[PDB]
């Protein structure tokens, strides 16, 4: 839900049960799954933003095209750039 407040605090693994290897594997899989989840959420929001801004650029260029003025052509030229990267 919120990838900025990292809470890696799941340390509760008591030693009496399970062999040491399984304890280590459980800690490792927990950390790995946290990293994977945060990276996945980041990428999904990034691609949503890119898709939405590309759609808006398309619609706004289509609308500004209808008038051929200096201001309108200047705005279309600004929107003409591809926006499929963060940079």
């Amino acid at each position: 839900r919120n990838m900025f407040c990292v809470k890696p605090l799941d340390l509760n693994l008591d030693r009496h049960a399970n062999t040491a290897l399984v304890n280590a594997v459980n800690k490792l899989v927990y950390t790995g799954r946290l990293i994977m989840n945060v990276r996945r959420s980041w990428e999904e929001l990034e691609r949503k933003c890119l898709a939405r801004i590309q759609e808006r650029c398309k619609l706004l260029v289509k609308e500004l095209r209808m008038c051929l003025s200096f201001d309108s052509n200047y705005c279309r030229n600004i929107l003409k750039h591809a926006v499929e990267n963060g940079d």
Partner: protein
């Protein structure tokens, strides 16, 4: 020799008196002149080194066997040997046969070192006795 270290003169006197007397096959023999020279000092030094290396090499499995057996077995052997010892389920927290065998081999070398202090060299092996026990026929081992 080992007991002589840091025990009073009279305490060592009493200990030497009691350790002198040996009973073996229903006859009693006494050691003449147990004297702590340098010749026994070398043996004491190697005994201390051998014991310390045994203690450092022995694994927690080796140490804890006695304690674990005492919790679930009872016998004259066990109660006797634990009376000789200090006083104080769950899984073993480290398990590795390869480490255990390497450690056991080194411990075998050390236990040979310690045994050679009391172990005399065999010179004859007996297979006969005259019924009066005056003579025997033996194989020479030298």
């Amino acid at each position: 020799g080992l007991f002589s270290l840091d025990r009073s003169y009279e305490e060592v006197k009493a200990a030497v008196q009691q350790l002198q007397t040996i009973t073996f096959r229903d006859a009693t023999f006494t050691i003449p002149d147990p004297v702590i020279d340098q010749h026994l000092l070398i043996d004491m030094k190697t005994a201390c080194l051998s014991m310390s290396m045994v203690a450092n090499l022995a694994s927690e499995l080796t140490m804890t066997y006695v304690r674990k057996l005492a919790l679930e077995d009872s016998s004259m052997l066990l109660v006797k040997c634990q009376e000789l010892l200090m006083r104080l389920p769950a899984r073993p927290q480290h398990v590795s046969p390869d480490d255990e065998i390497a450690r056991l081999s080194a411990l075998f070398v050390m236990l040979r070192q310690l045994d050679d202090l009391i172990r005399e060299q065999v010179v004859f092996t007996v297979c006969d006795v005259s019924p009066d026990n005056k003579s025997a026929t033996c194989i020479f081992k030298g």
